[PDB]
Design a protein around this nucleic acid. Structure first.
Lengths: 145, 147
DNA sequence: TCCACATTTGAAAGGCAAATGGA
DNA sequence: ATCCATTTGCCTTTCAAATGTGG
């Protein structure tokens, strides 16, 4: 009642501004990195502008985007030349074949140990912390429904 | 053979994804480093569609040589490719108009399909868009009709 | 230059789940 | 290291902007 009033107001303000200045959602997210050392994918930026993020997350992100706006209203060009060194935030994509191998291994063994994870990692050309996290999420998909 | 191309194209496209993923590059990344290598950036959508043989056969083949070369490059120089950006370009803007404008552009429809120089002037400055955009818009809208 | 109509091409948003943070 | 929740982005895809060609 209090937040989603002023948040809904800001979302409209960021979209119009973004479009006025001819920026795309990726651009903004990518320039957030240039300005603040903390880059953001267009997905994030679209969810912000659409209010699909949780309230805390909107609130955590408002100060960055507020800061972005007030930068764009003056030196718009030196942004359009600074963005287009990484604090990226990777997300591993795994090959359909490799994601299925891991599937086979699960459901016959839902909670492997570190001694399994290691062989599986080098076997499929993956880092170990990937396979490890993979299993935990796969388990969480189980307990989901 | 008409299908002998699609055999070679499907094999390349499979190699391209295989290479892209193992080397850890996203599709945005690839499309951007064509910008870097040939002078024209391509979007993730373009690369995604290329990887899925989603494009027309003619289109696939214009792109293929660029993508082949990217594979050829990315096997070795990997460090200096990701060290560039995370130079432009030139490529490739697309005006995303606001919803209010589009609707108030749709109003002249189905009022008048073929505005002519006079109407194209007024609407451009009023809605704060180049007069090129408006002409194009009214053309595109006309084609959606006949479709 | 304009127009038809064919064709290339990308911003944005949905699906799902990878990575992260807290206990 | 786990489980659990929550943050977050890759890939996808729709719809149309832009661009190409021939009149």
């Amino acid at each position: 009642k209090a937040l989603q009033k002023e948040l809904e107001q800001f979302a409209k303000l960021l979209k119009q501004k973004r479009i006025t200045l001819g920026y795309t959602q990726a651009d903004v997210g990518l320039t957030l990195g240039v300005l603040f050392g903390k880059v953001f994918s267009q997905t994030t930026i679209s969810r912000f502008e659409a209010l699909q993020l949780s309230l805390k997350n909107m609130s955590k992100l408002r100060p960055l985007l507020e800061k972005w706006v007030e930068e764009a209203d003056n030196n718009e060009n030196l942004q359009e030349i600074s963005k287009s060194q990484a604090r990226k935030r990777k997300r591993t994509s795994i090959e359909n074949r490799v994601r299925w191998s891991l599937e086979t291994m699960f459901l016959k063994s839902p909670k492997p140990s570190l001694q399994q994870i290691t062989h599986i990692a080098n076997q499929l050309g993956l880092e170990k912390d990937v396979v490890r996290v993979w299993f935990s999420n796969r388990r969480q998909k189980g307990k989901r429904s």
